[PDB]
Symmetry: D2
């Protein structure tokens, strides 16, 4: 393998798993074996919980500003090591260096930095009842929480989950995707180097159906935060609920609508649509994979999309000039190609792409060309179902209410956006769209201040923003009686 | 039966169920049938959801103050009908008229009154990103939500759940316990009279295993709020999660500790201990059913409890002078009796009652005498398990830290209280107790302003307070891009 | 004297002034003497304060909800007597019944109703410092506060000032404009009748120079809320500050800009411009009295404004069909006529109006015709100074930056607005305008939820919204030390 | 002079004043002239204002996180230079190195650090009105603000004022007391070094006799933040209000009561009393200079107080072992000795101290002995008036209500404290004390999170805590009309 065997991270150091088993992590660009990685056993989970329990106490006993300084130091190290972490994330994900260097660690660290500053701002309430009684609330740490990560933005997700959890005084046990375990382990090292107490951020590697479930089932874990696909999230949430009634946050999939109204500048609209479909090779949960264009503008829009797609630079993710890499894995590629075949079979018109790229060195990896289908219909499989690949579906509409009705006609509801220059239309339409993440005249930006998450089957709870911090604490109400107590007995 | 057959409440009127089936609600004071009540069918649930979908739109389309006024009118009607409703509640629950007339509706309306005034205060956030871009959030209604009630405080719980739900612009379908269906239907009538649009508060009667489950499963319901036992809670939360990923609130059971410190006045202590154990005949989720007393004070304390318990006026709930009624149902009495026997079997010392009361008329009702066990041990079944009856377990401790640790040694975490006159000890101890509802030198008061709910397996989320109003809305983030859009492609 | 002599309102009833002096309130519609009004002496002020001090204790002694119900009761009475109060305001101000019936009491009561619902929501904070210490804050009433009203919206202003003050648990002493004393006295009666404790809302009539100054000087008054001209506002603030360091809030004058952008609908633009200049006969502080029109639209815009101005129904305020009445007083009419002459003298082109209306019975009243000046320059007196009458100044511009700089080029900064259909321009321009009250594609609406007040010379602090309620309490921080205390000595 | 001539700080460097005038700053330990210091001219104030106007634009055009990082960098430098700055502050104030090294810069930077983390948290509101219209608020910088510091904690106060001002995106022109100008100039160098843009923190030297008044009266300054005596505050606020209606925050003087209740540990109570009177040689606004002791304990309390006072280590501030330094200046010494005379003259019993210490070297300094008067009475000049020196007044009382009533009988209201072990009495008592800063069983701690400031003539507005940050922004409300506009004309 390229790297030495990856071990569990428990108690501020690497420790040996006790399962006797390992798995491999593969570079999607060339099929290379990056590392053997240990599978945590059930007993290893137990060890991580007890470690977390004890570390959480040390961490909560500090002052708010002491925690803040430690998380800020972690931010400082992340900025220093951005490029090195990016290179590793590229190996592990297949995503272009041009993305990992500018987005993944940058925005992951942005959120850690945001919450680090907010630690001292976590406050309870005080309410007077009468002269002889008042109540005050405490926002106490939950204690030990678990994060379960997805493979498309490994370290960024580890950061978005751990930042609020640690800032609120918790310990987090994090399980990266079996598909992408490498950067999560580096994060844990960096937390320790920053002065995060032993046990406060532990990492367990392995599968979702095993280690994931052992975490969601454990009676001492008070909250689960999960990122991934909707069907998986239902299982995770059921398990977290029936085991011990955990609090849960779910960031799931979607089939987000992008509505281009007739007064839109078509260049901006095309720029938005491509960015909404082909960043990270189309492997972004919030992608605008149903693009609605007015009948009167279909041809010109298509021409603009085509021009942009034809100049997309698919290639070796190691090459800085690349802006479009392979998919995360061969099995994911096969899934995407199946959707592409479905699109052809159901008679959607292929505007461009539609196949795997195998020329030269690309045969070694899992490269699917940026793909655009048009003349789509709402009942098509590619229009209804999340593909999580570089596959745009263009849909013609005739009026605004129709476009909106159709955009809303889905069990998903993660994101939505509109392109228009009209003041009234922009807000009116966005207010009617049933999604948690709404963009006007742009797409994809997810500022640390902005709470993000899904409506409907696209999520439970939110991430980022002030409010999320609050959801990593639990409220204790304390009523102080200063007067007499009356009994009816 | 005493009353006519109770029908479903859908769309601002009573409609016939389509199950062809009924159940009986039984006066626990005398075993008589109060009414036959229709069971909702699966198609009845579907009917109620479509009704709520349409009503919610009418409700949400009004202004904040319009909703506020309508809810305040409901409050006025409730105050008007306090005694009448208290009478119906007494029949249905067996609870003394002296409780229902002054607690149930009073505090139910209190919470509704609280939220009615807060409708105009529900706000989003605005966050500038840069000169050319900013974000605002909207707190939109979830849409259709469902409440599932417990039998100990039927109309109160229906009010605590429906108030924040409707104030936040939602429609609620509410399912009363099969045990106590009567007052919920009355509430529905009152809401309609008050001007609540048709379909905004619908009531479905029947069993949890059927209608309850049909509600937690339905794809169009966005949130479930449940009150009941932890065991049932787990199944309800699992179902709500895995079906369509609904948001959930769970107000569950407990085994709440009351720690009496040496410096406490033992009169207040005894008053608190008894109030925390025998009000509503011991059928309060937050009851302090593990009472910790210092060894040096056990004797004097037991004497004060006994004296108090011996003057408790058990009797007919219709008699204004009764302050201790029968239990809610015969099967429930049997369950409590079993627990009492377990106490006897496990060699806890009986100090009080410990048997059914059959003297004369009481033989026709489900009466259990106020019961105190002392000399208990943490391993006894009556100490580890929720009884939900008039059964106090007195436990002896030798030091503060020991007491606090043993109080925390439970999977429950609903309530906790201390009795002490020392400034430092009151706050110090309370901060260390793992429960969401904490009382100092008092017990039982639950002001509308105070967020209440459980730690650990005692619940998920909270009710009442400013915070709960927020959790009946979904956050939508809107990024407005006023400037150029950059694409990497 | 159509009405009897008006006395002071102290301690829940009318009482005799000890000044031996009175003044007359007129009726600008004809010349009538509506009534004689007592002048408060310095001793009456002292008396109103002691009354306020004792009433405030009673008011504050109540529960949040108790205060809430009482203020809600007052709202109910105000809705009942809307038309009656309106008729009285119409006599006392000259404002058309059409306005006073639909605006003055309606929106005055809106604000009171908004705040009544919010009483229970006033809360402090809780901040943990460390295991052995935490702090909580209380928001306590200031105590006794004073409101000084303006004459353009007498009862609405009394309501906007008293509502938040009373809701936060204070007593207010209110001083109406000498010009318009009548409706304030009625409001006092209405409060008392609703259950407001004696002394909590007292009314003192007389001059600003005297009783106004006596209020701002009193060492027992904790806060002053003032509405009027900027010149007077300066005097008032200096007095309130230098005497006893009172908290202060001031809503003052303006010369608010309205920018019509070249993409605007001219019908809407003209509607907005006329509404922004001629409602209440041009006696609104927030009026858009500098109207910027793009050169390309000037001719079409002037035509559209003229057509609307010419159909303005000036007339008897008593007639339901009147929508434009006399000014508030003859002296004020003279001031307006002076400004109008200034405009003529400096060679502004007169588009319409420009003189007193004396035909028929109108000659008995203080009627100035709807006046529009065009071809204005920024250094004209009518463009530079607040006229507070029916006089619109139209200013041509060539580009956005120019219009914005000019709009900002003033010591005022109360309000501003833009008319445009472009999403980007609407928000971009509004963000650059230096005013506290900004309207996009509308003008004049002032929701109870919306904080309003001026930038620069146009005011200090705000009215309405959640923020204003907070500013009628004072913050007390309480640090609870539960551990050891350390001295360096 | 020990140092070279001190210049003005404008635009990120030192510049020559244009007054032709200088003043001296004197080491109060030895009468040594530390430095000549230039006096800003009126044209210099103008120059600083124009510099701030331009710097503020650069500062406010950065992102929130950019501002945050720059303030965090200033924090790091302050931590680095803590001892160096402490040494210089000791020279300037005469305060013991043991104080300046552990309090002044530490707690100054604590507040800056606190606010640095909060920059991204400053948000507006969003309020929906109806489907076709909503409002959002912006929290915009005030622009240019002025801070006016006191001489007792020169650099700490400079930090406490500039931190929230800069965090909220303003520029601040700061005027240190002529008595202590040195460290503020260093602070300005440090901000510049951290990356604060030129003009954002400017420092002008001079006195309240000239530059103080030029700052407060300046038309382009939007807010004044002032710390000093109530008498001076009154003048300042009159000027700020009447010149251009500035917002004003004032932290003024006090005569803060410390109530020792009969159940208190007299050792703690004594520790508290001495800490509350002799830290910084009694030069602390919040000092508990009226100490209420119950008659039954007077004797014992005076003994413990005397015992502690006698072991106070008065001496050279340059010596680490010193914990009690000279006063800040010889004129201030004269003022204090005057009050001590008044004490003697009004026949209060002198328990200890009461004179200038002139032994050996101390003769060359401004040392006043730790002084305690007892058997005091409420009409005594030393009891009503702020001395701002080492002069404790002990007062006997008989019952609880009396102590409280007397503690509240003052025009002051800055701080208050109670010592007691009783839960009920602690909260009860503190809730009735009319002060903004209340301590239970401790004294003097002022956490960055705790809003602090005075009731009554002791201050206007607050410093520190979340709420203070909001007060360095101004609210703009924006109503967006998406629907039709309705005109009555
Ligand atoms: O005290 P419990 O915890 O047994 O029940 C309290 C409430 O939840 C309902 N409930 C019980 N089981 C389920 C279930 N499996 N799914 C949904 N709701 C349920 C009850 O139905 P029920 O009407 O049978 O009490 C009742 O209204
Ligand atoms: K991999
Ligand atoms: K959901
Ligand atoms: K029943
Ligand atoms: K839980
Ligand atoms: K009049
Ligand atoms: K101002
Ligand atoms: K000095
Ligand atoms: K004050």
């Amino acid at each position: 393998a390229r790297f030495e065997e990856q071990k569990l991270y428990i108690g501020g150091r690497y420790v040996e798993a006790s399962s006797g088993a390992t798995f491999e992590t593969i570079n999607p660009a060339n099929g290379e074996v990056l590392a053997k990685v240990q599978r945590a056993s059930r007993e290893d989970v137990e060890r991580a919980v007890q470690s977390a329990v004890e570390g959480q106490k040390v961490w909560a006993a500090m002052t708010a500003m002491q925690r803040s300084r430690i998380l800020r130091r972690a931010v400082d190290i992340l900025r220093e090591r951005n490029d090195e972490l990016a290179a590793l994330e590229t190996l592990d994900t297949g995503k272009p260096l041009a993305e990992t260097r500018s987005v993944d660690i940058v925005t992951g660290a942005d959120v850690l930095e945001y919450y680090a500053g907010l630690v001292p701002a976590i406050e309870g309430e005080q309410i007077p009842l009468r002269e002889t009684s008042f109540v005050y609330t405490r926002r106490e740490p939950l204690g030990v929480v678990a994060g379960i990560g997805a493979w498309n933005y490994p370290v960024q997700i580890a950061l978005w989950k751990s930042a609020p959890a640690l800032a609120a005084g918790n310990a987090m046990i994090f399980k990266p995707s079996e598909v992408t375990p490498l950067t999560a382990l580096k994060l844990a090292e960096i937390y320790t180097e920053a002065g995060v107490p032993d046990g406060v951020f532990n990492v367990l590697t392995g599968s979702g159906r095993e280690v994931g479930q052992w975490l969601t089932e454990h009676p001492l874990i008070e909250k689960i935060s999960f990122t991934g696909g909707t069907s998986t999230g239902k299982k995770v949430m059921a398990s977290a609920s029936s085991s011990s009634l955990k609090e849960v946050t779910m960031a799931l999939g979607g089939k987000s609508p992008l509505i281009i109204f007739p007064d839109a500048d078509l260049d901006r609209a095309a720029d938005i649509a491509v960015m909404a479909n082909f960043f990270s090779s189309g492997q972004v949960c919030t992608n605008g994979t149903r693009v609605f264009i007015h009948r009167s503008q279909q041809a010109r829009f298509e021409a603009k999309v085509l021009e942009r797609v034809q100049r997309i630079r698919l290639g070796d993710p190691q090459d800085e000039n690349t802006n479009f890499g392979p998919l995360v894995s061969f099995p994911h590629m096969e899934s995407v190609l199946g959707y592409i075949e479905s699109g052809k079979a159901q008679k959607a018109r292929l505007l461009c792409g539609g196949e795997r790229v195998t020329d030269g060195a690309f045969g070694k990896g899992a490269y699917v060309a940026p793909t655009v289908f048009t003349d789509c219909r709402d009942d098509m499989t590619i229009v209804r179902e999340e593909i999580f690949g570089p596959v745009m579906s263009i849909l013609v509409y005739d009026d605004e209410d129709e476009a909106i009705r159709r955009a809303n006609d889905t069990e998903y509801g993660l994101a939505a956006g509109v392109v228009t220059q009209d003041l009234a239309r922009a807000h009116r339409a966005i207010h009617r769209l049933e999604a948690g993440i709404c963009w006007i005249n742009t797409w994809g930006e997810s500022p640390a201040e902005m709470p993000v998450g899904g409506y409907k089957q696209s999520g439970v709870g939110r991430e980022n923003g002030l409010t999320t911090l609050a959801h990593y604490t639990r409220i204790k109400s304390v009523q102080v009686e200063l007067g007499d107590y009356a009994s009816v007995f």
